[PDB]
């Protein structure tokens, strides 16, 4: 096995650049529980929240365009279509509500979950929403007729996070019973399980190119290849967890938000963790309220958006000075996992 360890002292990864804090946007009155940004014009967030509003911010200036209210209890999640001009948001009152942007109103209510709904995603080529939450099944909503065509039965626990992809394995989901399934829809059943993680699997993301999926866990953040449901890599992470979120990028940066209030960026290829940051919590807050509840990257790949339990959004910028000058991070001493 030592072979394996000799190899890891060669390749010596991919210099990436630091990050820092460009901007802080207050204005929500609760925690900020999801962010989702235009797949087209990059002018605007849309930001979930725990006061049940959803405010639409402006990317460049940081001003507030509008408020879409219209939920009773907290909104967990949002998604914005590419093809359609729609916006599905979903909350914990058990309801998955389409929106229509052109008029800024609600349109279709999809319906039938037994209990609160923690995640939506919007399949790319088919016109289908997919959703799931504490019921432990993943429903696949047809969009115009509102029928839940198919229900993916499955795990043994709340479902934290659902992702869609164009070829097979079409739908991928992770769940507090510590798996991650890879679903084959028409068949209607699981095509593969990846069991490794040790406790709940709390986040995921899809490499926007490489066709694989980062799956966090509590304290150890693996990747996985699709098609085979390989293993691929294992990011060097001591216990910094609890990992709330992942975000991949176009340059193969990886983000990961902690609840201890630490941003942890990685290279994707490697596992090398090349930067950490204490997120200055806030004015009058409570040390527990430093944490990070969501992340995403704009469409350019150069700007970071996160919400935080202290009722605010922060936007992080990729500092250009860098190169090597005195750039380097933690300097690559791969260890025995």
């Amino acid at each position: 096995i030592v072979n394996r360890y000799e190899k890891l002292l060669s390749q010596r990864p991919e210099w990436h650049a630091p990050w820092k804090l460009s901007r802080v946007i207050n204005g929500h009155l609760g925690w900020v529980r999801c962010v989702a940004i235009d797949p087209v014009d990059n002018e605007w967030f849309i930001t979930g929240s725990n006061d049940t509003t959803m405010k639409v911010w402006d990317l460049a200036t940081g001003k507030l365009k509008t408020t879409l209210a219209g939920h009773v209890m907290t909104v967990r999640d949002v998604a914005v279509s590419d093809r359609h001009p729609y916006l599905f948001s979903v909350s914990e009152d058990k309801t998955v509500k389409c929106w229509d942007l052109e008029k800024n109103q609600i349109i279709r209510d999809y319906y039938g979950h037994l209990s609160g709904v923690r995640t939506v995603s919007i399949h790319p080529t088919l016109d289908l929403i997919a959703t799931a939450g504490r019921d432990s099944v993943i429903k696949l909503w047809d969009m115009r007729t509102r029928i839940p065509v198919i229900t993916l039965v499955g795990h043994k626990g709340p479902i934290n996070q659902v992702q869609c992809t164009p070829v097979d394995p079409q739908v991928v989901s992770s769940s507090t019973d510590a798996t991650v399934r890879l679903w084959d829809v028409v068949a209607g059943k699981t095509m593969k399980v990846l069991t490794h993680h040790k406790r709940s699997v709390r986040a995921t993301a899809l490499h926007p190119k490489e066709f694989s999926v980062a799956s966090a866990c509590t304290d150890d953040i693996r990747s996985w290849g699709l098609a085979e449901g390989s293993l691929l890599t294992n990011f060097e992470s001591e216990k910094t967890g609890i990992i709330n979120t992942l975000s991949i990028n176009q340059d193969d940066v990886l983000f990961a938000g902690g609840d201890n209030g630490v941003l942890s960026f990685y290279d994707y290829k490697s596992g090398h963790k090349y930067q950490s940051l204490a997120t200055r919590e806030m004015v009058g807050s409570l040390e527990g309220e430093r944490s990070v509840l969501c992340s995403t990257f704009d469409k350019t790949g150069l700007r970071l958006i996160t919400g935080e339990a202290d009722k605010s959004i922060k936007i992080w910028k990729q500092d250009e000075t860098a190169t090597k000058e005195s750039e380097p991070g933690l300097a690559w001493n791969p260890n025995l996992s």
Binding site: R4, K7, L8, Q11, P13, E14, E210, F211, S212, S223, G225, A227, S230, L231, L232, T233, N234, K269, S270
Partner: peptide, 26 residues
């Protein structure tokens, strides 16, 4: 029989495939 006994589990499924080479292509 060595294969019959533990048959299912096998070590090649613990072992990450980009540890050897980065750049393995997908």
């Amino acid at each position: 029989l060595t294969d019959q006994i533990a048959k299912n589990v096998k070590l090649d499924d613990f072992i990450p495939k980009r540890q050897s080479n980065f750049e393995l292509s997908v």
